[PDB]
Design an enzyme around this catalytic site. Structure first.
Site, PDB file in Angstrom:
ATOM      1  N   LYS D 154       0.839  -1.191   0.000  1.00 24.32           N
ATOM      2  CA  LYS D 154       0.000   0.000   0.000  1.00 24.32           C
ATOM      3  C   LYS D 154       0.874   1.240   0.000  1.00 24.32           C
ATOM      4  O   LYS D 154       0.600   2.197  -0.730  1.00 24.32           O
ATOM      5  CB  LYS D 154      -0.941   0.000   1.204  1.00 24.32           C
ATOM      6  CG  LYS D 154      -1.877  -1.191   1.259  1.00 24.32           C
ATOM      7  CD  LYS D 154      -2.575  -1.279   2.602  1.00 24.32           C
ATOM      8  CE  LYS D 154      -1.721  -2.012   3.617  1.00 24.32           C
ATOM      9  NZ  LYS D 154      -2.285  -1.915   4.989  1.00 24.32           N
ATOM     10  N   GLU D 180       1.293   5.648  10.961  1.00 25.21           N
ATOM     11  CA  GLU D 180       2.246   5.026  10.055  1.00 25.21           C
ATOM     12  C   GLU D 180       3.655   5.293  10.570  1.00 25.21           C
ATOM     13  O   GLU D 180       3.859   6.037  11.534  1.00 25.21           O
ATOM     14  CB  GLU D 180       2.093   5.557   8.623  1.00 25.21           C
ATOM     15  CG  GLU D 180       2.379   7.047   8.472  1.00 25.21           C
ATOM     16  CD  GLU D 180       2.543   7.469   7.026  1.00 25.21           C
ATOM     17  OE1 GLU D 180       2.058   6.743   6.135  1.00 25.21           O
ATOM     18  OE2 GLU D 180       3.157   8.528   6.777  1.00 25.21           O
ATOM     19  N   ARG D 181       4.638   4.677   9.920  1.00 28.75           N
ATOM     20  CA  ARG D 181       6.008   4.770  10.405  1.00 28.75           C
ATOM     21  C   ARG D 181       6.637   6.138  10.150  1.00 28.75           C
ATOM     22  O   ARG D 181       6.544   6.709   9.052  1.00 28.75           O
ATOM     23  CB  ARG D 181       6.865   3.676   9.766  1.00 28.75           C
ATOM     24  CG  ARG D 181       6.141   2.345   9.611  1.00 28.75           C
ATOM     25  CD  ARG D 181       7.106   1.168   9.557  1.00 28.75           C
ATOM     26  NE  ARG D 181       7.443   0.798   8.183  1.00 28.75           N
ATOM     27  CZ  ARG D 181       6.785  -0.107   7.463  1.00 28.75           C
ATOM     28  NH1 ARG D 181       5.728  -0.733   7.967  1.00 28.75           N
ATOM     29  NH2 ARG D 181       7.173  -0.374   6.224  1.00 28.75           N
TER      30      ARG D 181
END
Lengths: 507, 90, 180, 475, 295, 141
Positions: D154, D180-181
């Protein structure tokens, strides 16, 4: 106004007034306690009971205070008095933990003395941001051929060791720990040295003792510290121990040093958090795990970072470990951690029962960093090795028809089988980077295709001793330049030719 | 959340200083009924697994003794029992 | 309805029946004022370190050492037997808010700053002809959001007559923002 | 108005006001605290008590601390000064480049546009990706969903769409990261500063000049409480609504892991005192999402194209969160692990993928017929998986064998090496136009490529590359 | 201490004390009925009230019934006198041969060995069986799974292991039956008395003389309530820790089934009101299994 | 004092309204004088009759193999993106000829489309598809 009456009748009333710093237990059970009092207590604050036991002030209700006990529910009674320590839950850090096994709270257990103290960095701190962080641009020498070649681990990474039980996770961890001895002893500069932390969660104490004994045997405790929260220990301590190890590593991350933490069991941390939640009556979810498990693991793993040029330049890697059940990675916890990590090292029971050890699959194992966590000398070889292994994995479906197939397919199968037998290694036997480069050069230059598979072991060993006896200049030149120039390449080809000449094999 | 002792017929006695607790450990008053269960106040002295008997001849087993009430399971329908009935130990 | 509602209704009923009203009436005011002025009786009531026997002993000593009826003592013994002593203040509030009611109500009331004896007299006489309750012992308070116009609560719950400036103003504005 | 903290439970704070209460959604600032702790009111409970959710950590709070009501909800700045800049949920920049000198601030919470103020005009996007350009065309001015588990691509797909759209867009754009990271956040920031999407300039006096930027950034990541994860998408939507309301421009809005917007509520409602639904989710699982999605819509003033990445826990598409999210989308792209294990990337399942812009009244009839023929072929190939696994291909007839051959060929042909994958793939990127894809699909269905092998379609883009690779493999 | 029962809900007894509450896991003896009833504390609740799990049945109990606090957890006797005997969770014998005249008693809840008092050198266990010593070598301090029912020679394998470890290693042995069938226990006892594992010799006066034997027995019968079957393995484990610590021996410990241990833990947690985990098991599963097996 | 109720009549035909009869088309109020309670008792066994008239759906497989009457309650069950809304919209569109070619209200078929959970973009697309075919003078939404 009327205090004389209470002082006369209760006989000790004047002392129970200051409920701001002292409290009284009310209920006990399931590792949770309720206190009346302690109005000036901070959330997350450390609390000290009567018999030396400790706890965390988790919930602050309107009147009562809900506390989690870092121990068993037998040193805490209803009626016991409770004090404030005046500080958030904290653990010691710095030099002094190196070579030391400790509990979740920095208390030693191996019986060698107390531990010095810094200002006791906190435990549940916040991670860094975006600007001080930096991309990964240097390697972490693990000492395994397959890892250092195809699945390179960087310096500032969070890579997962995932696999069913009895597959060689702790072996990979301890080899990564042991390989740093020569690099640390040969440097004397903390910018290049790599320390380490090993967090055991729910692990068998005999196994932890054996690990510590093997590290003291191989002198791999000058630069490592261990944090033990075993199965006999309570659940809050297993919940903590990873955060305590990360707090111990933040000193190296923030002081320009480099480190690597190895949480040998995160599923046990998640099981303990599920336990504490269900005992706190919280609502379960998928597989009974609450929704705060992603946050639980990410709080811990997002601290692993490569600080930038202006934040000292330190680093903190992370090698979390996970046990699966029948290789299922479509479960909840494996996917929760794969969505947090920057890579994946997979381990199989089929290859481990066949004999391939370390049983590191290569089609499922990946790494987002990749070549940036490699040196050019190892890039030039591991690229070809990865390509040839991909070809072998592709064309292995029709290996039984090798006689019916062309010479190209048989050559691909031979090269792939030789490489697969070359990636094997013994336990507690790492390899330097120059030696890895030499061995994989031998493999990817067809010197092992005609050679029998079973011979490749002793072949390799002899070759290693040869290049550790005569071609030390080659090894130092590779370790210095970090590159395989044409001159070193020709020298290496000459050495390989002299070795195949001076040595006899089955083919 | 109210206890059977806290209903507004007994507190008119307690507030009035009435000390008519001479009601023995044998007799109790029904507080709630439903689905084959009854809940009594009293019988401090009844054994677990013991039989008790209602006004209308029916009988039941006392199972869930509690700090404020006693839980009884009925050997029959609930039409016979109604709140306010008396129960005695056998 | 509620727990304190139940105990207050029981006490109101029994004191309307057997002993008297005025004794318990004065008792509830004295008990509430002791709770709100001593600052240690409250902790004595809330703390669990105090044993039930010490609680009952101190309560009986307060009975003997003060003008005290047996009905209130039985109330306190019941609240101790049922672990409802922390509900003392609440019970007192309920007993003062239906109720404390046959003789004379106590009401809250707010201004901006110190009013005068003249308009104080006017306020009390107007609230008295509105109440038709011959006894009214009120409170004064100072909250300046309702600018100066006199807001109050004659304590029976369903009558908070909001004679104020800002409140009528905002209600009117929100009314006249209606469409057409 | 001043208030006092009475109770604290994780990411929940119970406050007591004396004089006058604040409304719901209003912001409160805690004073006796190190950082700037903000609380968003959520409920009222009586006794002049209020319940609030904290935008930061509650470690250090005390029962008695003082709280100040700001009188309005959270306010995020807006303008062309937010462009080329990162901003957390409370608007505070964490780019370490100075403050945000914006004139106007908008509230995080706004009512959606009405029914009459909507315009559903059908457009298309040029993504450069074969699978979406053929079988799931993306709608200009509509919502797009990328559903997937963990490790299916994704983030890589979103980065490719960014590279192939935002740089060739001209208008403005926004990116929201919801759990998210931080690594990939910094990577996106640096890739934008490289590609010119963000144009940072350091003046001599330490100030900065982001004039020329074409992308805003909002980041509430995994290192944040649920209150700081369930309010970031709304910040990004306010930042985009300012553009597409006042400036009138058409904007893009890429969002990463909207699922966290629900996960936070899952790790908050238990503390707020709500009964759990089937799998622990909320009873408000549909309304809390629709109030977010209905703000995303093309109108008569401007347009928001949206690209949302939707996590799928345990590879279960029947989960309530993705099940509800499916109803709000104009285009869909469901990634699969079974196809990624075959080495196919993007691992798009073209049967679970769908769209509303595939009808012949939008795309041509040749496009429609090619797409439907490909879908028929892939379904006919799926229908033989069991009998192939048990018995084998030899049991099949010749028509079925031809179908299987063409289905494997078109599977391998629907695979593209992206440019951002060059770091872990090595092979250069391949932009692909739509008519070339359509011609290639027509030829593969007709039978003008049955002579070629099966591994000649893997990561080649058009057909000339496939034929060149077949030539080179003939040797 | 002395307290009173306030309510009885099956195997869950709530008790009230006036002062100096007992800690958790302590033992309480009920007074006022036969069939001596012992209650293990598990939880404090407030109002000087505690909750307890009963080791036997609760039928015939009364509110206000008096209870004594022993001041320590369930204390099992230990010694060489427990060899050849059978014992229940509360240490009492159920073999109808007299009381256990032991000079010592150990709690069943003992802390595991520390990190320092642990051997880093692993070593095999010389059993004397060929397939075992060849293809599945045992270890000292180890834990060996035994997947097999009847019709396979399991009881005979057990007796052979016991006899060989007693002959060679000089170490005694223990067998724990965690919710086992009573006829199976009787069969095992008679097989031991036949094979010489137990030496029950009559004396002149009418007592017995359990001379040099090779195995103690601890049976938590299936007819026993949940709370015993969960605290039986700890009894046998303390009986073995006695031989390990003081006598300095290498002993064995056979367990008839660990799944019934888990069943009992899950039951006890359901009675006490703990929310069950994934498949009904308790949330303290790995923790309890570790508290057991780390010793 | 009012139980929750909604307006009824031919004033709703051609209009789009919320759950409570408040219009959202943005063009004028709802000209209807008679209201009706929301929750009501269904009609009993006696004031009913058998189903004998067909409901022309416009499709072929429906009208042939799965016929529909006037007075029926037929479910349309399927997966996402399978052609559920399209069946109903074709059923609505097929009626404009039947209604235009008559002035007998006993033979005209009016229509009501209740959209629960949908997005306003989808509802607007449906309204557009109906206005493009003059299929709103006998429907309401």
């Amino acid at each position: 106004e009327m205090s004389r009456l209470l002082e006369e009748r209760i006989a000790g009333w004047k002392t129970q007034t200051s409920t701001e710093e002292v409290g009284r237990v009310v209920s006990v059970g399931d590792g949770i306690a309720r206190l009346f009092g302690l109005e000036g207590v901070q959330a997350g604050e450390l609390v000290e009971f009567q018999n030396g036991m400790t706890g965390m002030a988790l919930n602050l209700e309107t009147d009562n205070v809900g506390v989690v006990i870092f121990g068993d529910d037998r040193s805490v009674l209803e009626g016991d008095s409770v004090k404030r320590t005046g500080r958030i839950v904290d653990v010691p850090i710095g030099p002094g933990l190196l070579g030391r096994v400790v509990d979740a709270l920095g208390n030693p257990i191996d019986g060698k003395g107390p531990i010095p103290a810094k200002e006791r960095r906190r435990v549940e701190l916040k991670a860094p941001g975006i600007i001080p962080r930096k991309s990964v641009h240097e390697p972490m020498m693990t000492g395994l051929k397959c890892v250092d070649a195809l699945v390179p681990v960087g310096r500032g990474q969070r890579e997962l060791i995932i696999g069913d039980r009895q597959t060689g996770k702790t072996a990979v961890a301890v080899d990564a720990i042991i390989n740093q001895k020569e690099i640390n002893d040969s440097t004397d500069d903390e910018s290049k040295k790599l320390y380490c932390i090993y967090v055991a969660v729910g692990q068998k104490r005999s196994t932890v003792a054996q690990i510590v004994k093997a590290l003291e045997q191989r002198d791999a405790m000058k630069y490592t510290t261990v944090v033990a929260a075993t199965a006999s220990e309570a659940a809050p301590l297993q919940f903590l121990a990873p955060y305590s190890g990360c707090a111990m590593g933040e000193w190296f991350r923030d002081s320009g040093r480099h480190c690597v933490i190895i949480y040998d069991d995160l599923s046990k941390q998640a099981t303990a958090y599920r336990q504490m939640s269900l005992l706190l009556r919280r609502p379960p979810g998928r597989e009974a795990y609450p929704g705060d498990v992603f946050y639980l693991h990410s709080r811990l793993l997002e601290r692993a970072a490569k600080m930038g040029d202006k934040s000292g330049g330190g680093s903190l890697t992370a090698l979390p470990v996970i046990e699966t059940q029948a290789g299922d990675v479509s479960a909840y916890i494996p996917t929760n951690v794969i969505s947090i990590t920057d890579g994946q090292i997979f381990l199989e029971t089929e290859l481990f029962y066949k004999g391939i050890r370390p049983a590191i699959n290569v089609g499922l194992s990946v790494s987002r960093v990749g070549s940036a966590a490699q040196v050019k000398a190892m890039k030039q070889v591991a690229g070809t090795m990865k390509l040839e292994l991909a070809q072998y994995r592709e064309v292995a479906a029709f290996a039984q028809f090798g006689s019916d197939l062309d010479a190209s397919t048989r050559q691909l199968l031979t090269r792939g089988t030789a490489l697969t037998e070359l990636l094997k290694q013994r336990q507690y036997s790492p390899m330097k980077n120059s030696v890895q480069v030499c061995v994989l050069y031998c493999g990817v230059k067809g010197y092992l295709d005609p050679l029998d598979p079973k011979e490749i072991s002793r072949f390799e060993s002899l070759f290693i001793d040869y290049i550790n006896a005569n071609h030390q200049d080659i090894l130092k030149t590779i370790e210095t330049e970090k590159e395989l120039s044409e001159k070193t390449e020709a020298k290496l080809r000459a050495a390989v030719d002299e070795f195949v000449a001076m040595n006899e094999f089955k083919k | 959340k109210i206890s059977p002792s806290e209903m507004s017929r007994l507190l008119e006695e307690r507030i009035a200083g009435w000390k008519t607790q001479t009601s023995t450990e044998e007799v109790g008053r029904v507080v709630s009924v439903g689905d084959g269960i009854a809940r009594l106040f009293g019988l401090e002295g009844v054994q677990a697994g013991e039989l008790v008997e209602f006004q209308n001849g029916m009988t039941g087993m006392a199972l869930n003794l509690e700090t404020d009430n006693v839980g009884v399971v009925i050997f029959g329908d609930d039409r016979s029992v109604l709140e306010g009935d008396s129960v005695k130990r056998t | 309805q509620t727990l304190e509602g139940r105990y207050a209704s029981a006490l109101f009923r029994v004191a309307k029946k057997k002993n008297q009203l005025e004794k318990v009436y004065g008792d509830l005011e004295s008990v509430r004022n002791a709770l709100k002025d001593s600052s240690e009786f409250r902790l004595f009531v809330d703390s669990p370190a105090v044993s039930v026997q010490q609680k009952l002993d101190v309560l009986r000593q307060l009975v003997n050492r003060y003008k005290f009826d047996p009905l209130t003592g039985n109330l306190l013994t019941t609240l101790v037997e049922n672990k409802r002593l922390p509900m003392l203040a609440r019970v007192a509030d309920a007993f003062d808010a239906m109720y404390r009611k046959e003789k004379g109500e106590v009401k809250c009331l707010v201004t901006s700053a110190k009013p005068l004896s003249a308009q104080q007299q006017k306020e009390i006489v107007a609230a008295l002809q509105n109440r038709a309750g011959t006894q009214a012992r009120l409170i004064i308070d100072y909250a300046v959001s309702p600018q100066i116009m006199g807001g109050l609560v004659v304590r029976l719950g369903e009558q908070v007559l909001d004679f104020s400036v800002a409140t009528r103003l905002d209600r009117l504005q929100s009314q006249l923002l209606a469409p057409l | 108005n001043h208030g006092r903290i009475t109770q604290v439970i994780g990411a929940v704070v119970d406050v007591h006001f004396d004089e006058q209460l604040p409304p719901i959604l209003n912001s409160l600032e805690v004073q006796g605290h190190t950082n700037r702790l903000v609380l968003e009111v959520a409920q009222h409970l009586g006794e002049n008590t209020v319940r609030t959710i904290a935008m930061d950590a509650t470690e250090g709070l005390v029962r008695g601390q003082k709280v100040v009501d700001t009188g309005a909800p959270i306010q995020v700045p807006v303008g062309v000064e937010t462009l080329g800049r990162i901003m957390n949920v409370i608007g505070e920049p964490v780019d370490e480049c100075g403050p945000v000198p914006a004139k106007k601030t908008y509230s995080i919470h706004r009512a959606a546009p009405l029914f009459a103020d909507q315009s559903t005009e059908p457009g298309l996007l040029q993504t450069g990706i074969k699978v979406v350009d053929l079988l799931a065309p993306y709608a200009k001015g509509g919502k797009i969903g990328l559903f997937g588990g963990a490790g299916v691509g994704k983030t890589v797909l979103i980065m490719e769409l960014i590279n192939n759209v935002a740089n060739k867009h001209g208008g403005f754009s926004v990116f929201a990261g919801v759990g998210e990271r931080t690594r990939e956040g910094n990577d996106l920031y640096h890739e934008m500063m490289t590609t010119g999407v963000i144009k940072r300039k350091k003046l001599e006096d330490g100030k900065f000049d982001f004039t020329g930027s074409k992308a805003a950034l909002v980041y509430g990541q995994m290192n944040e409480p649920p209150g700081a994860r369930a309010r970031v998408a709304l910040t990004a939507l306010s930042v985009a609504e300012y553009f597409r309301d006042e400036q009138g421009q058409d904007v893009l809005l890429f969002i990463d892991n909207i699922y966290r917007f629900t996960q936070a509520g899952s790790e908050v409602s238990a503390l707020l005192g709500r009964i759990p639904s089937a799998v622990g989710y909320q009873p408000t699982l549909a309304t809390d999402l629709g109030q977010l999605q209905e703000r995303i819509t093309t109108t008569k003033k401007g347009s928001i194209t949206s690209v949302q990445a939707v996590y799928v826990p345990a590879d279960d598409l029947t989960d309530p969160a993705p099940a509800t999210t499916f109803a709000h989308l104009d285009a869909t792209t469901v990634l699969s692990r079974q196809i990624a294990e075959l080495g196919i990337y993007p691992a798009v399942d073209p049967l679970d993928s769908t769209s509303r812009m595939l009808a012949p009244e939008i795309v041509g009839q040749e496009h429609y017929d090619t797409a439907r023929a490909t879908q028929k072929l892939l379904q006919d190939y799926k229908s033989l998986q069991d009998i192939i696994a048990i018995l084998g291909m030899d049991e099949l007839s010749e028509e079925d064998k031809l179908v299987v051959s063409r289905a494997r060929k078109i599977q391998r042909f629907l695979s593209q090496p992206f440019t951002v994958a060059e770091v872990f793939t090595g092979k250069p990127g391949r932009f692909v136009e739509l008519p070339e894809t359509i011609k290639s699909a027509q030829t593969i269905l007709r039978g003008e490529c049955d002579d070629l092998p099966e591994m000649a379609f893997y990561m080649c883009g058009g057909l000339e590359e496939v034929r060149s690779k077949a030539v080179k493999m003939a040797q």
